[PDB]
Amino acid sequence: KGAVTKLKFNSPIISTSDQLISTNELLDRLKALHEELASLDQDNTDLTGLDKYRDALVSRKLLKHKDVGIRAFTACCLSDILRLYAPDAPYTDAQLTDIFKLVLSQFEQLGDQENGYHIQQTYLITKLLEYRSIVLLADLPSSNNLLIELFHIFYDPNKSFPARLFNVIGGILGEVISEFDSVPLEVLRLIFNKFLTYNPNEIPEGLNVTSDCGYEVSLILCDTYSNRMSRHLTKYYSEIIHEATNDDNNSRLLTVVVKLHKLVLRLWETVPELINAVIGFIYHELSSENELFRKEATKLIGQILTSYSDLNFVSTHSDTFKAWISKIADISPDVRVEWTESIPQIIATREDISKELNQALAKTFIDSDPRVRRTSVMIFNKVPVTEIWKNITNKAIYTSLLHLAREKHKEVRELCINTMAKFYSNSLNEIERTYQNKEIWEIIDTIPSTLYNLYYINDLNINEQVDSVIFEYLLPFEPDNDKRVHRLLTVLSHFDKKAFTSFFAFNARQIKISFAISKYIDFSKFLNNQESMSSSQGPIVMNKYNQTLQWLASGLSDSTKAIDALETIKQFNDERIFYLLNACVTNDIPFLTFKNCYNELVSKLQTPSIMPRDIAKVIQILLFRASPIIYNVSNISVLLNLSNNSDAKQLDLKRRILDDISKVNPTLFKDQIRTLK
């Protein structure tokens, strides 16, 4: 009881009828008492001649005093009283609650506008944490309520606390909760909901210095006090699902589970150290009876594998990861698709996995359900070709791709043809060849040959597709004149006998179709003026042109779409269009000017019995079979011996091509030379 320091303050604080103390005087006195009790040392101090104020600083007349100042100083004085006397704990539970219920009022006022006493309030919250005198609130018959109130004060939106106390607030709420074993679910919501209600990088502005207390606090507790929050996180997730399931509403469980997943997703992006607390639940969700939950669980893990994190998932939670990829055989196709729909992002976000993916995708490309196979081929469409050759490298993958080209399913077949097509084009204008990647090229080089084989199954639809596709990726109409032949050879490089026969056949028809469109216009210009409405060939030519238009419309899926197309063109009778069209079939035409007349021809038909749109998509795919593309000026490029020796895999092609181009009929060939002599 005897020390070196002693309380110097010895003035009345309680105002009675006999002896009263004005507000100001009492305010100043409490100020002195406060400033002194703060300098007093815990150990070396009398403390004996202080009890007088111990029983005075609890008078309800002061705790609920009008003037905020008195209550402020009183709270500061009490904070030190608990400090000094500690651990003796002088005040009883009753008196203690009245004090902790007053301090909360201070924290509440600390958020509101300055009452001219924030300094004292700041000292309160700070000292109450430094001396750990705030934990005393944890061991009370009303700690639960005081806890909920404590959090509501800081997490109160209508409040505005300085970024300076953020670290302090996290300490208060941190130590106070670290004393609880079963924190009210109400408190948990308030703490976790911040990860959902507040999401940064949402509004691209100038500084984003806005910041938020509730959020930062949640992070402090989930980071600094993760060891104690993880235990509660499991309770929260478990309690929520529990509450929503028993809920009279049968359409709430699925709505709440989706949020929890989003919460976990956010937690993993901020504090992936707590995900281990509820990682177990998810694990079983995947193999849960209800597929919906399995679908959501699969989608969740799929989103986590695409979010930035200081920690690794497949490394930390490998048990669940294997369960994730194990959904490639899930009974529910929806779960399968939901899975395959995440691969694109993952592959474009990480390269960590290149084994499980190739093993799963291999089965996904041959799954019974068409939906998944479609979502599988979509990969080569969404994710860039580059990332494709880098990540996936499985043999079955490519093979299965080109395999679906001959599949009965249309929607899948169509998408496939187009995909594996553009893929081939981009697989040559970006990725090169090495001593290791060439192991799979034998599949990408056989693509052009494959497409041409589709002409054998004989199908108006397929044929049209192939035609439009080839001249869209494989053999383009740009950019120069040399590179065309260069690639034209790289395309015909890996070609089987059927590929060539069909290749040449597709050309042998071009000269015939050309002889048609040519006359088509010669018979179309029939109405350029009165000629033989019933004179010359009127009764025969009419049925000549009318029966010739069906010829070029017999190789089209919708013949009734062509006969009406060219028929309306006959109605227009515009010499212009007739010129371009005719100037695109007269054979022997500079590839350059061809692209000019063609491009302008299809563009002039746009936005003019039905929309001309059809006429365009019909005449276009009709010209690819008519107009000469490969059998033109390209002859000179190949005519010029680009090789003096070696590279025999090119000379044989030069032969294969020219040898056939000459077989067309030298009927006109051996004539030019004669006129030249």
GROMACS .gro file of C-alpha atoms in nm, residues 53-373:
model
  321
   53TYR     CA    1  -1.304   0.838  -0.613
   54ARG     CA    2  -1.358   0.470  -0.690
   55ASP     CA    3  -1.701   0.486  -0.526
   56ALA     CA    4  -1.767   0.833  -0.666
   57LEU     CA    5  -1.686   0.777  -1.034
   58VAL     CA    6  -1.978   0.532  -1.042
   59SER     CA    7  -2.259   0.761  -0.928
   60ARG     CA    8  -2.543   0.738  -1.181
   61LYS     CA    9  -2.549   1.117  -1.154
   62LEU     CA   10  -2.219   1.128  -1.342
   63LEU     CA   11  -2.254   0.833  -1.580
   64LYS     CA   12  -2.570   0.980  -1.731
   65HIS     CA   13  -2.478   1.346  -1.685
   66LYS     CA   14  -2.615   1.589  -1.943
   67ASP     CA   15  -2.287   1.764  -2.025
   68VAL     CA   16  -2.091   1.527  -2.250
   69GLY     CA   17  -1.766   1.656  -2.104
   70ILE     CA   18  -1.830   1.513  -1.758
   71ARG     CA   19  -1.921   1.173  -1.903
   72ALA     CA   20  -1.614   1.191  -2.126
   73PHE     CA   21  -1.370   1.263  -1.844
   74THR     CA   22  -1.552   1.024  -1.611
   75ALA     CA   23  -1.507   0.748  -1.869
   76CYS     CA   24  -1.138   0.836  -1.898
   77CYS     CA   25  -1.104   0.831  -1.519
   78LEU     CA   26  -1.279   0.494  -1.495
   79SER     CA   27  -1.059   0.349  -1.769
   80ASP     CA   28  -0.758   0.425  -1.550
   81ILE     CA   29  -0.929   0.299  -1.234
   82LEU     CA   30  -0.981  -0.043  -1.391
   83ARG     CA   31  -0.619  -0.019  -1.503
   84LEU     CA   32  -0.463   0.054  -1.163
   85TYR     CA   33  -0.679  -0.166  -0.939
   86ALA     CA   34  -0.653  -0.450  -1.192
   87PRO     CA   35  -0.652  -0.741  -1.170
   88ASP     CA   36  -0.831  -0.695  -0.837
   89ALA     CA   37  -1.133  -0.575  -1.034
   90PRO     CA   38  -1.281  -0.331  -0.777
   91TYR     CA   39  -1.618  -0.266  -0.942
   92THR     CA   40  -1.880  -0.542  -0.940
   93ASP     CA   41  -2.047  -0.692  -1.247
   94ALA     CA   42  -2.342  -0.457  -1.200
   95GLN     CA   43  -2.139  -0.137  -1.169
   96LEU     CA   44  -1.905  -0.270  -1.437
   97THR     CA   45  -2.183  -0.302  -1.695
   98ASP     CA   46  -2.301   0.052  -1.624
   99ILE     CA   47  -1.945   0.165  -1.698
  100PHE     CA   48  -1.901  -0.046  -2.011
  101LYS     CA   49  -2.241   0.078  -2.126
  102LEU     CA   50  -2.112   0.434  -2.086
  103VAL     CA   51  -1.785   0.370  -2.267
  104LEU     CA   52  -1.983   0.231  -2.561
  105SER     CA   53  -2.172   0.560  -2.567
  106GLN     CA   54  -1.834   0.730  -2.598
  107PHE     CA   55  -1.734   0.512  -2.893
  108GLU     CA   56  -2.074   0.591  -3.044
  109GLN     CA   57  -2.012   0.964  -3.004
  110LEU     CA   58  -1.660   0.914  -3.137
  111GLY     CA   59  -1.818   0.840  -3.473
  112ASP     CA   60  -2.048   1.142  -3.471
  113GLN     CA   61  -1.936   1.501  -3.526
  114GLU     CA   62  -1.679   1.638  -3.281
  115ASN     CA   63  -1.841   1.735  -2.951
  116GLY     CA   64  -1.513   1.899  -2.856
  117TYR     CA   65  -1.401   1.595  -2.658
  118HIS     CA   66  -1.274   1.343  -2.913
  119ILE     CA   67  -0.930   1.374  -2.754
  120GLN     CA   68  -1.061   1.221  -2.431
  121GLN     CA   69  -1.263   0.963  -2.624
  122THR     CA   70  -0.956   0.876  -2.832
  123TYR     CA   71  -0.755   0.838  -2.512
  124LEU     CA   72  -1.034   0.612  -2.384
  125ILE     CA   73  -1.042   0.361  -2.670
  126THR     CA   74  -0.662   0.364  -2.699
  127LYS     CA   75  -0.583   0.314  -2.330
  128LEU     CA   76  -0.862   0.058  -2.288
  129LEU     CA   77  -0.680  -0.149  -2.550
  130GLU     CA   78  -0.321  -0.085  -2.441
  131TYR     CA   79  -0.399  -0.193  -2.085
  132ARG     CA   80  -0.641  -0.463  -2.201
  133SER     CA   81  -0.906  -0.327  -1.963
  134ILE     CA   82  -1.172  -0.363  -2.232
  135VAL     CA   83  -1.174  -0.743  -2.205
  136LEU     CA   84  -1.346  -0.704  -1.868
  137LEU     CA   85  -1.664  -0.653  -2.070
  138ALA     CA   86  -1.633  -1.009  -2.202
  139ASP     CA   87  -1.696  -1.165  -1.861
  140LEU     CA   88  -2.038  -1.021  -1.776
  141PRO     CA   89  -2.398  -1.152  -1.754
  142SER     CA   90  -2.474  -0.927  -2.051
  143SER     CA   91  -2.151  -0.964  -2.248
  144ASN     CA   92  -2.340  -1.107  -2.545
  145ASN     CA   93  -2.554  -0.794  -2.580
  146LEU     CA   94  -2.263  -0.561  -2.507
  147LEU     CA   95  -2.069  -0.746  -2.777
  148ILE     CA   96  -2.336  -0.702  -3.043
  149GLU     CA   97  -2.374  -0.336  -2.950
  150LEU     CA   98  -1.997  -0.281  -2.954
  151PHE     CA   99  -1.976  -0.405  -3.313
  152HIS     CA  100  -2.287  -0.221  -3.431
  153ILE     CA  101  -2.125   0.102  -3.313
  154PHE     CA  102  -1.820   0.072  -3.537
  155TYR     CA  103  -1.990  -0.108  -3.827
  156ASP     CA  104  -2.258   0.162  -3.818
  157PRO     CA  105  -2.272   0.322  -4.167
  158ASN     CA  106  -2.408   0.648  -4.025
  159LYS     CA  107  -2.080   0.672  -3.834
  160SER     CA  108  -1.749   0.812  -3.957
  161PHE     CA  109  -1.436   0.709  -3.766
  162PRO     CA  110  -1.086   0.834  -3.859
  163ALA     CA  111  -0.849   0.599  -4.043
  164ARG     CA  112  -0.621   0.651  -3.742
  165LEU     CA  113  -0.832   0.442  -3.504
  166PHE     CA  114  -0.885   0.164  -3.759
  167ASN     CA  115  -0.596  -0.036  -3.613
  168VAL     CA  116  -0.724   0.041  -3.263
  169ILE     CA  117  -1.083  -0.058  -3.339
  170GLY     CA  118  -0.956  -0.386  -3.479
  171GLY     CA  119  -0.777  -0.442  -3.151
  172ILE     CA  120  -1.077  -0.365  -2.931
  173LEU     CA  121  -1.320  -0.584  -3.125
  174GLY     CA  122  -1.036  -0.832  -3.156
  175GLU     CA  123  -0.952  -0.882  -2.789
  176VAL     CA  124  -1.315  -0.863  -2.677
  177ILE     CA  125  -1.415  -1.141  -2.916
  178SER     CA  126  -1.106  -1.349  -2.837
  179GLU     CA  127  -1.263  -1.398  -2.494
  180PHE     CA  128  -1.582  -1.548  -2.636
  181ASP     CA  129  -1.638  -1.913  -2.729
  182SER     CA  130  -1.980  -1.876  -2.890
  183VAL     CA  131  -2.020  -1.532  -3.049
  184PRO     CA  132  -2.380  -1.442  -3.149
  185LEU     CA  133  -2.464  -1.513  -3.513
  186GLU     CA  134  -2.583  -1.153  -3.537
  187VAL     CA  135  -2.227  -1.036  -3.478
  188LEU     CA  136  -2.085  -1.275  -3.738
  189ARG     CA  137  -2.314  -1.146  -4.013
  190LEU     CA  138  -2.210  -0.785  -3.951
  191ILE     CA  139  -1.843  -0.885  -3.974
  192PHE     CA  140  -1.867  -1.108  -4.283
  193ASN     CA  141  -2.132  -0.915  -4.478
  194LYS     CA  142  -1.873  -0.639  -4.527
  195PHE     CA  143  -1.691  -0.865  -4.773
  196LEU     CA  144  -2.011  -0.868  -4.978
  197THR     CA  145  -2.145  -0.517  -4.923
  198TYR     CA  146  -1.802  -0.362  -4.981
  199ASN     CA  147  -1.598  -0.456  -5.288
  200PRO     CA  148  -1.304  -0.239  -5.403
  201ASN     CA  149  -1.194  -0.176  -5.763
  202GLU     CA  150  -1.565  -0.145  -5.843
  203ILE     CA  151  -1.569   0.222  -5.943
  204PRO     CA  152  -1.271   0.344  -6.150
  205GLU     CA  153  -1.213   0.696  -6.017
  206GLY     CA  154  -0.924   0.921  -5.919
  207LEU     CA  155  -0.780   0.810  -5.585
  208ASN     CA  156  -1.039   0.577  -5.429
  209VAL     CA  157  -0.923   0.719  -5.096
  210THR     CA  158  -1.281   0.677  -4.974
  211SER     CA  159  -1.198   0.367  -4.770
  212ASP     CA  160  -1.429   0.202  -4.515
  213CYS     CA  161  -1.404   0.118  -4.145
  214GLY     CA  162  -1.622  -0.192  -4.133
  215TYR     CA  163  -1.422  -0.354  -4.412
  216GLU     CA  164  -1.073  -0.278  -4.281
  217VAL     CA  165  -1.184  -0.398  -3.938
  218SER     CA  166  -1.311  -0.726  -4.082
  219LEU     CA  167  -0.970  -0.774  -4.243
  220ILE     CA  168  -0.786  -0.708  -3.916
  221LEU     CA  169  -0.993  -0.970  -3.734
  222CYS     CA  170  -0.971  -1.216  -4.023
  223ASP     CA  171  -0.596  -1.161  -4.052
  224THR     CA  172  -0.455  -1.076  -3.709
  225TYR     CA  173  -0.713  -1.289  -3.527
  226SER     CA  174  -0.761  -1.555  -3.795
  227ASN     CA  175  -0.674  -1.835  -3.553
  228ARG     CA  176  -0.980  -1.746  -3.344
  229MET     CA  177  -1.208  -1.630  -3.626
  230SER     CA  178  -1.167  -1.949  -3.829
  231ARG     CA  179  -1.349  -2.134  -3.552
  232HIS     CA  180  -1.635  -1.886  -3.581
  233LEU     CA  181  -1.629  -1.878  -3.961
  234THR     CA  182  -1.716  -2.248  -3.960
  235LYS     CA  183  -2.002  -2.170  -3.722
  236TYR     CA  184  -2.126  -1.884  -3.940
  237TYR     CA  185  -2.134  -2.083  -4.264
  238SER     CA  186  -2.291  -2.375  -4.079
  239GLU     CA  187  -2.544  -2.160  -3.893
  240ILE     CA  188  -2.648  -1.971  -4.207
  241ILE     CA  189  -2.719  -2.285  -4.410
  242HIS     CA  190  -2.898  -2.429  -4.106
  243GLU     CA  191  -3.119  -2.122  -4.063
  244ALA     CA  192  -3.201  -2.105  -4.434
  245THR     CA  193  -3.283  -2.475  -4.462
  246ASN     CA  194  -3.534  -2.487  -4.175
  247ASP     CA  195  -3.672  -2.157  -4.304
  248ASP     CA  196  -4.038  -2.193  -4.400
  249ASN     CA  197  -3.933  -2.062  -4.742
  250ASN     CA  198  -3.810  -2.350  -4.958
  251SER     CA  199  -3.640  -2.113  -5.202
  252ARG     CA  200  -3.396  -1.951  -4.958
  253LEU     CA  201  -3.136  -2.224  -4.906
  254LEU     CA  202  -3.015  -2.196  -5.265
  255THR     CA  203  -3.011  -1.816  -5.244
  256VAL     CA  204  -2.803  -1.808  -4.925
  257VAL     CA  205  -2.558  -2.079  -5.031
  258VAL     CA  206  -2.471  -1.872  -5.337
  259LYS     CA  207  -2.375  -1.578  -5.117
  260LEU     CA  208  -2.165  -1.790  -4.881
  261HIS     CA  209  -1.972  -1.911  -5.186
  262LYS     CA  210  -1.920  -1.549  -5.290
  263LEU     CA  211  -1.808  -1.481  -4.934
  264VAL     CA  212  -1.558  -1.767  -4.954
  265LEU     CA  213  -1.443  -1.640  -5.294
  266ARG     CA  214  -1.380  -1.296  -5.145
  267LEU     CA  215  -1.220  -1.441  -4.832
  268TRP     CA  216  -0.980  -1.640  -5.051
  269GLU     CA  217  -0.884  -1.323  -5.239
  270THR     CA  218  -0.814  -1.136  -4.915
  271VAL     CA  219  -0.745  -1.396  -4.646
  272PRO     CA  220  -0.718  -1.741  -4.812
  273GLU     CA  221  -0.604  -1.868  -4.472
  274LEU     CA  222  -0.960  -1.889  -4.340
  275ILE     CA  223  -1.098  -2.080  -4.639
  276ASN     CA  224  -0.969  -2.393  -4.466
  277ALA     CA  225  -1.240  -2.334  -4.205
  278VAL     CA  226  -1.524  -2.402  -4.449
  279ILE     CA  227  -1.332  -2.593  -4.716
  280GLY     CA  228  -1.472  -2.912  -4.566
  281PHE     CA  229  -1.835  -2.820  -4.629
  282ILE     CA  230  -1.765  -2.744  -4.995
  283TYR     CA  231  -1.580  -3.074  -5.035
  284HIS     CA  232  -1.899  -3.262  -4.948
  285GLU     CA  233  -2.117  -3.020  -5.145
  286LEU     CA  234  -1.961  -3.147  -5.468
  287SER     CA  235  -2.076  -3.501  -5.390
  288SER     CA  236  -2.406  -3.388  -5.238
  289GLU     CA  237  -2.738  -3.546  -5.337
  290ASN     CA  238  -2.888  -3.227  -5.479
  291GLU     CA  239  -2.709  -3.151  -5.806
  292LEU     CA  240  -2.781  -2.778  -5.779
  293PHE     CA  241  -2.551  -2.746  -5.478
  294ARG     CA  242  -2.292  -2.953  -5.665
  295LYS     CA  243  -2.322  -2.716  -5.961
  296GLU     CA  244  -2.273  -2.411  -5.739
  297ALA     CA  245  -1.987  -2.577  -5.552
  298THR     CA  246  -1.821  -2.660  -5.883
  299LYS     CA  247  -1.872  -2.303  -6.005
  300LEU     CA  248  -1.727  -2.170  -5.680
  301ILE     CA  249  -1.401  -2.365  -5.699
  302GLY     CA  250  -1.391  -2.269  -6.065
  303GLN     CA  251  -1.392  -1.900  -5.973
  304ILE     CA  252  -1.126  -1.948  -5.705
  305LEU     CA  253  -0.887  -2.103  -5.956
  306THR     CA  254  -0.904  -1.776  -6.151
  307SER     CA  255  -0.859  -1.522  -5.871
  308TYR     CA  256  -0.532  -1.370  -5.752
  309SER     CA  257  -0.411  -1.510  -5.419
  310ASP     CA  258  -0.086  -1.505  -5.223
  311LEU     CA  259  -0.159  -1.871  -5.153
  312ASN     CA  260  -0.206  -2.162  -5.394
  313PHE     CA  261  -0.527  -2.366  -5.400
  314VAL     CA  262  -0.430  -2.694  -5.569
  315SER     CA  263  -0.135  -2.697  -5.328
  316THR     CA  264  -0.321  -2.608  -5.008
  317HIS     CA  265  -0.654  -2.777  -5.080
  318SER     CA  266  -0.550  -3.061  -5.310
  319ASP     CA  267  -0.812  -3.288  -5.154
  320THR     CA  268  -1.094  -3.070  -5.285
  321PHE     CA  269  -0.914  -2.994  -5.611
  322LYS     CA  270  -0.912  -3.361  -5.711
  323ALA     CA  271  -1.280  -3.367  -5.615
  324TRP     CA  272  -1.333  -3.070  -5.845
  325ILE     CA  273  -1.181  -3.232  -6.154
  326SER     CA  274  -1.373  -3.543  -6.048
  327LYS     CA  275  -1.690  -3.371  -6.170
  328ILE     CA  276  -1.598  -3.438  -6.532
  329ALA     CA  277  -1.785  -3.764  -6.476
  330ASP     CA  278  -2.062  -3.613  -6.263
  331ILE     CA  279  -2.402  -3.769  -6.332
  332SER     CA  280  -2.550  -3.423  -6.391
  333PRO     CA  281  -2.456  -3.286  -6.736
  334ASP     CA  282  -2.522  -2.937  -6.599
  335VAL     CA  283  -2.238  -2.992  -6.352
  336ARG     CA  284  -2.020  -3.114  -6.638
  337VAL     CA  285  -2.091  -2.806  -6.848
  338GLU     CA  286  -2.067  -2.572  -6.549
  339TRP     CA  287  -1.718  -2.718  -6.510
  340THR     CA  288  -1.605  -2.704  -6.873
  341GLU     CA  289  -1.723  -2.341  -6.879
  342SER     CA  290  -1.446  -2.243  -6.637
  343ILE     CA  291  -1.151  -2.398  -6.822
  344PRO     CA  292  -1.115  -2.099  -7.061
  345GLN     CA  293  -1.054  -1.850  -6.779
  346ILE     CA  294  -0.835  -2.085  -6.576
  347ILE     CA  295  -0.611  -2.160  -6.874
  348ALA     CA  296  -0.588  -1.787  -6.944
  349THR     CA  297  -0.509  -1.712  -6.579
  350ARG     CA  298  -0.273  -1.991  -6.472
  351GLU     CA  299  -0.043  -2.257  -6.616
  352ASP     CA  300  -0.003  -2.436  -6.283
  353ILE     CA  301  -0.208  -2.727  -6.418
  354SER     CA  302  -0.133  -2.898  -6.750
  355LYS     CA  303  -0.187  -3.260  -6.647
  356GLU     CA  304  -0.531  -3.294  -6.489
  357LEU     CA  305  -0.678  -3.062  -6.753
  358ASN     CA  306  -0.560  -3.272  -7.047
  359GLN     CA  307  -0.683  -3.584  -6.867
  360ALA     CA  308  -1.027  -3.435  -6.801
  361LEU     CA  309  -1.079  -3.251  -7.130
  362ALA     CA  310  -0.993  -3.579  -7.304
  363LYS     CA  311  -1.307  -3.733  -7.153
  364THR     CA  312  -1.510  -3.413  -7.187
  365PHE     CA  313  -1.453  -3.417  -7.564
  366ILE     CA  314  -1.599  -3.767  -7.586
  367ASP     CA  315  -1.880  -3.734  -7.332
  368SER     CA  316  -2.222  -3.878  -7.418
  369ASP     CA  317  -2.396  -3.542  -7.376
  370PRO     CA  318  -2.353  -3.297  -7.669
  371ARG     CA  319  -2.374  -2.986  -7.449
  372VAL     CA  320  -2.037  -3.057  -7.288
  373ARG     CA  321  -1.870  -3.147  -7.617
   0.00000   0.00000   0.00000
